[PDB]
Amino acid sequence: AGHMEKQQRKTFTAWCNSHLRKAGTQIENIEEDFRDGLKLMLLLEVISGERLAKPERGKMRVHKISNVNKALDFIASKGVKLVSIGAEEIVDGNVKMTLGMIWTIILRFAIQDISVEETSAKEGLLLWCQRKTAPYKNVNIQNFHISWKDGLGFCALIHRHRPELIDYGKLRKDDPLTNLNTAFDVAEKYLDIPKMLDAEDIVGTARPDEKAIMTYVSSFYHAFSGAQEFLEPG
Q1: Rounded Cα distance, 25 and 214, in Å
Q2: Residue 180 · residue 199 · CB < 8 Å
Q3: Coiled-coil region(s) at which residues?
Q4: How many domains does the chain have?
Q5: What is the largest CA-CA distance in the chain?
Q6: In terms of domains, do 27 and 96 share one?
Q7: Residue 115: beta bridge partners?
Q8: What value does the CA radius of gyration of the chain take, rounded to a whole number of Å?
Protein backbone atom coordinates (compact mmCIF):
# COMPACT_ATOMS: atom_id res chain seq x y z
CA ALA A 1 0.00 0.00 0.00
CA GLY A 2 2.99 2.26 -0.57
CA HIS A 3 5.54 3.24 -3.22
CA MET A 4 6.87 -0.30 -3.60
CA GLU A 5 3.44 -1.67 -4.48
CA LYS A 6 2.64 1.31 -6.69
CA GLN A 7 5.82 0.89 -8.75
CA GLN A 8 5.41 -2.86 -9.08
CA ARG A 9 1.75 -2.41 -10.05
CA LYS A 10 2.83 -0.08 -12.86
CA THR A 11 5.78 -2.09 -14.14
CA PHE A 12 4.35 -5.60 -13.79
CA THR A 13 1.15 -4.50 -15.54
CA ALA A 14 3.15 -3.03 -18.45
CA TRP A 15 5.35 -6.12 -18.71
CA CYS A 16 2.34 -8.45 -18.71
CA ASN A 17 0.66 -6.43 -21.44
CA SER A 18 3.83 -6.32 -23.55
CA HIS A 19 3.34 -10.08 -23.85
CA LEU A 20 -0.45 -10.43 -23.88
CA ARG A 21 -0.62 -8.12 -26.91
CA LYS A 22 0.77 -11.10 -28.83
CA ALA A 23 -2.28 -13.11 -27.77
CA GLY A 24 -4.67 -10.39 -28.90
CA THR A 25 -5.61 -9.31 -25.38
CA GLN A 26 -4.73 -6.93 -22.53
CA ILE A 27 -5.42 -6.51 -18.84
CA GLU A 28 -6.73 -3.23 -17.42
CA ASN A 29 -6.31 -3.95 -13.71
CA ILE A 30 -3.67 -6.37 -12.49
CA GLU A 31 -5.52 -7.07 -9.23
CA GLU A 32 -8.71 -8.15 -11.01
CA ASP A 33 -7.92 -9.56 -14.44
CA PHE A 34 -6.06 -12.72 -13.30
CA ARG A 35 -8.70 -13.74 -10.75
CA ASP A 36 -10.42 -16.29 -12.99
CA GLY A 37 -7.08 -17.57 -14.27
CA LEU A 38 -7.96 -17.28 -17.96
CA LYS A 39 -5.61 -14.42 -18.86
CA LEU A 40 -2.98 -15.86 -16.53
CA MET A 41 -2.99 -19.08 -18.54
CA LEU A 42 -2.83 -17.06 -21.76
CA LEU A 43 0.15 -15.06 -20.49
CA LEU A 44 1.95 -18.29 -19.67
CA GLU A 45 1.24 -19.75 -23.11
CA VAL A 46 2.76 -16.68 -24.75
CA ILE A 47 5.96 -16.49 -22.70
CA SER A 48 6.53 -20.27 -22.75
CA GLY A 49 5.38 -20.98 -26.29
CA GLU A 50 3.44 -24.00 -25.05
CA ARG A 51 -0.26 -24.82 -24.68
CA LEU A 52 -1.62 -25.32 -21.17
CA ALA A 53 -4.53 -27.58 -20.20
CA LYS A 54 -7.93 -26.52 -21.53
CA PRO A 55 -9.53 -23.92 -19.21
CA GLU A 56 -12.67 -25.04 -17.40
CA ARG A 57 -15.86 -23.04 -17.90
CA GLY A 58 -18.21 -21.58 -15.33
CA LYS A 59 -17.68 -18.49 -13.18
CA MET A 60 -18.00 -20.46 -9.95
CA ARG A 61 -15.49 -19.99 -7.12
CA VAL A 62 -14.34 -23.60 -7.50
CA HIS A 63 -13.75 -23.25 -11.25
CA LYS A 64 -11.54 -20.18 -10.87
CA ILE A 65 -9.45 -21.87 -8.19
CA SER A 66 -9.11 -24.78 -10.61
CA ASN A 67 -7.83 -22.60 -13.47
CA VAL A 68 -5.36 -20.78 -11.24
CA ASN A 69 -4.04 -24.09 -9.92
CA LYS A 70 -3.51 -25.22 -13.52
CA ALA A 71 -1.40 -22.10 -13.96
CA LEU A 72 0.43 -22.63 -10.67
CA ASP A 73 1.14 -26.25 -11.59
CA PHE A 74 2.48 -25.16 -14.97
CA ILE A 75 4.91 -22.55 -13.60
CA ALA A 76 6.15 -25.06 -11.04
CA SER A 77 6.81 -27.50 -13.89
CA LYS A 78 8.83 -24.78 -15.64
CA GLY A 79 10.99 -24.15 -12.60
CA VAL A 80 9.48 -20.87 -11.43
CA LYS A 81 10.56 -20.27 -7.84
CA LEU A 82 7.96 -21.36 -5.28
CA VAL A 83 7.07 -18.63 -2.79
CA SER A 84 3.89 -19.91 -1.13
CA ILE A 85 1.48 -18.41 -3.65
CA GLY A 86 -2.03 -19.61 -2.90
CA ALA A 87 -4.70 -20.11 -5.55
CA GLU A 88 -7.33 -18.75 -3.16
CA GLU A 89 -5.52 -15.43 -2.72
CA ILE A 90 -5.06 -15.08 -6.48
CA VAL A 91 -8.74 -15.77 -7.13
CA ASP A 92 -9.70 -13.25 -4.43
CA GLY A 93 -7.69 -10.50 -6.11
CA ASN A 94 -5.10 -10.10 -3.35
CA VAL A 95 -2.75 -7.55 -4.89
CA LYS A 96 0.31 -8.41 -2.78
CA MET A 97 0.11 -12.10 -3.69
CA THR A 98 -0.67 -11.39 -7.34
CA LEU A 99 2.32 -9.07 -7.76
CA GLY A 100 4.46 -11.61 -5.92
CA MET A 101 3.39 -14.36 -8.31
CA ILE A 102 4.00 -12.23 -11.40
CA TRP A 103 7.47 -11.35 -10.10
CA THR A 104 8.51 -15.01 -9.92
CA ILE A 105 7.26 -15.43 -13.48
CA ILE A 106 9.24 -12.42 -14.72
CA LEU A 107 12.34 -13.62 -12.89
CA ARG A 108 12.11 -17.10 -14.43
CA PHE A 109 11.18 -16.26 -18.01
CA ALA A 110 12.96 -12.96 -18.57
CA ILE A 111 15.97 -13.11 -16.23
CA GLN A 112 17.07 -16.54 -15.01
CA ASP A 113 18.42 -17.81 -18.35
CA ILE A 114 20.58 -14.75 -18.93
CA SER A 115 24.20 -15.89 -19.18
CA VAL A 116 27.20 -13.57 -19.25
CA GLU A 117 30.80 -14.76 -18.78
CA GLU A 118 29.72 -17.75 -16.67
CA THR A 119 27.56 -15.44 -14.53
CA SER A 120 23.80 -15.95 -14.74
CA ALA A 121 20.33 -14.71 -13.80
CA LYS A 122 20.18 -11.40 -11.89
CA GLU A 123 23.96 -11.42 -11.44
CA GLY A 124 24.41 -11.98 -15.17
CA LEU A 125 22.04 -9.15 -16.10
CA LEU A 126 23.97 -6.81 -13.81
CA LEU A 127 27.32 -7.84 -15.28
CA TRP A 128 25.95 -7.26 -18.78
CA CYS A 129 24.91 -3.73 -17.75
CA GLN A 130 28.32 -3.08 -16.22
CA ARG A 131 30.19 -4.36 -19.28
CA LYS A 132 28.06 -2.35 -21.71
CA THR A 133 28.28 0.93 -19.76
CA ALA A 134 31.97 0.49 -18.87
CA PRO A 135 33.16 3.17 -21.37
CA TYR A 136 30.79 5.83 -20.01
CA LYS A 137 32.62 8.08 -17.55
CA ASN A 138 29.43 9.35 -15.91
CA VAL A 139 27.89 5.92 -15.29
CA ASN A 140 28.68 3.37 -12.57
CA ILE A 141 26.15 0.54 -12.40
CA GLN A 142 26.33 -1.34 -9.09
CA ASN A 143 22.72 -2.36 -8.50
CA PHE A 144 19.17 -2.25 -9.86
CA HIS A 145 18.01 0.85 -8.00
CA ILE A 146 20.04 3.95 -7.08
CA SER A 147 22.51 3.33 -9.93
CA TRP A 148 19.75 4.13 -12.42
CA LYS A 149 18.17 7.20 -10.82
CA ASP A 150 19.94 9.82 -12.95
CA GLY A 151 18.85 8.13 -16.16
CA LEU A 152 22.31 7.99 -17.73
CA GLY A 153 22.54 4.23 -17.31
CA PHE A 154 19.47 3.75 -19.48
CA CYS A 155 20.77 6.26 -22.02
CA ALA A 156 24.20 4.61 -22.07
CA LEU A 157 22.75 1.14 -22.70
CA ILE A 158 20.96 2.55 -25.73
CA HIS A 159 23.92 4.61 -26.97
CA ARG A 160 26.19 1.58 -26.64
CA HIS A 161 24.09 -0.40 -29.13
CA ARG A 162 22.42 2.31 -31.22
CA PRO A 163 24.47 5.51 -30.90
CA GLU A 164 22.54 7.24 -33.71
CA LEU A 165 19.43 7.26 -31.50
CA ILE A 166 20.79 9.39 -28.64
CA ASP A 167 23.03 12.47 -28.53
CA TYR A 168 24.65 11.30 -25.30
CA GLY A 169 27.03 14.25 -25.13
CA LYS A 170 24.16 16.67 -24.59
CA LEU A 171 22.94 14.80 -21.50
CA ARG A 172 23.72 16.28 -18.07
CA LYS A 173 23.86 14.12 -14.94
CA ASP A 174 22.20 16.90 -12.92
CA ASP A 175 19.19 16.76 -15.26
CA PRO A 176 17.84 13.24 -14.45
CA LEU A 177 14.24 13.90 -15.53
CA THR A 178 15.42 14.80 -19.04
CA ASN A 179 17.72 11.78 -19.22
CA LEU A 180 15.07 9.31 -18.05
CA ASN A 181 12.39 10.65 -20.39
CA THR A 182 14.82 10.62 -23.32
CA ALA A 183 15.70 6.97 -22.71
CA PHE A 184 12.09 5.90 -22.14
CA ASP A 185 10.85 7.63 -25.29
CA VAL A 186 13.65 6.29 -27.48
CA ALA A 187 13.13 2.73 -26.22
CA GLU A 188 9.38 2.91 -26.82
CA LYS A 189 9.64 4.42 -30.30
CA TYR A 190 12.66 2.56 -31.67
CA LEU A 191 13.13 -0.59 -29.59
CA ASP A 192 9.49 -1.60 -29.11
CA ILE A 193 9.94 -1.51 -25.33
CA PRO A 194 6.82 -0.12 -23.62
CA LYS A 195 7.25 2.52 -20.93
CA MET A 196 7.31 0.57 -17.67
CA LEU A 197 8.80 3.16 -15.32
CA ASP A 198 7.56 6.61 -14.32
CA ALA A 199 10.42 9.10 -14.65
CA GLU A 200 9.21 11.46 -11.93
CA ASP A 201 8.80 8.61 -9.45
CA ILE A 202 12.31 7.32 -10.18
CA VAL A 203 13.79 10.74 -9.43
CA GLY A 204 11.60 11.37 -6.39
CA THR A 205 12.00 8.00 -4.67
CA ALA A 206 15.06 7.71 -2.42
CA ARG A 207 15.35 4.09 -3.54
CA PRO A 208 13.28 3.03 -6.57
CA ASP A 209 11.90 -0.52 -6.56
CA GLU A 210 14.62 -2.87 -7.84
CA LYS A 211 12.16 -5.48 -9.10
CA ALA A 212 10.51 -2.88 -11.31
CA ILE A 213 13.86 -1.61 -12.62
CA MET A 214 15.19 -5.14 -13.15
CA THR A 215 12.07 -5.96 -15.16
CA TYR A 216 12.56 -2.93 -17.41
CA VAL A 217 16.30 -3.54 -17.81
CA SER A 218 15.69 -7.17 -18.76
CA SER A 219 13.57 -5.87 -21.66
CA PHE A 220 16.59 -3.86 -22.83
CA TYR A 221 18.72 -6.99 -22.59
CA HIS A 222 16.34 -8.94 -24.81
CA ALA A 223 16.00 -6.07 -27.28
CA PHE A 224 19.80 -6.06 -27.72
CA SER A 225 20.48 -9.81 -27.43
CA GLY A 226 19.98 -10.40 -31.13
CA ALA A 227 17.45 -13.11 -30.32
CA GLN A 228 14.88 -11.29 -32.45
CA GLU A 229 17.06 -12.17 -35.44
CA PHE A 230 16.22 -15.87 -35.06
CA LEU A 231 13.07 -16.08 -32.91
CA GLU A 232 9.52 -15.34 -34.01
CA PRO A 233 7.65 -13.15 -31.46
CA GLY A 234 4.38 -15.06 -31.72
Answers
A1: 24
A2: yes
A3: none
A4: 2
A5: 59
A6: yes
A7: 120
A8: 18
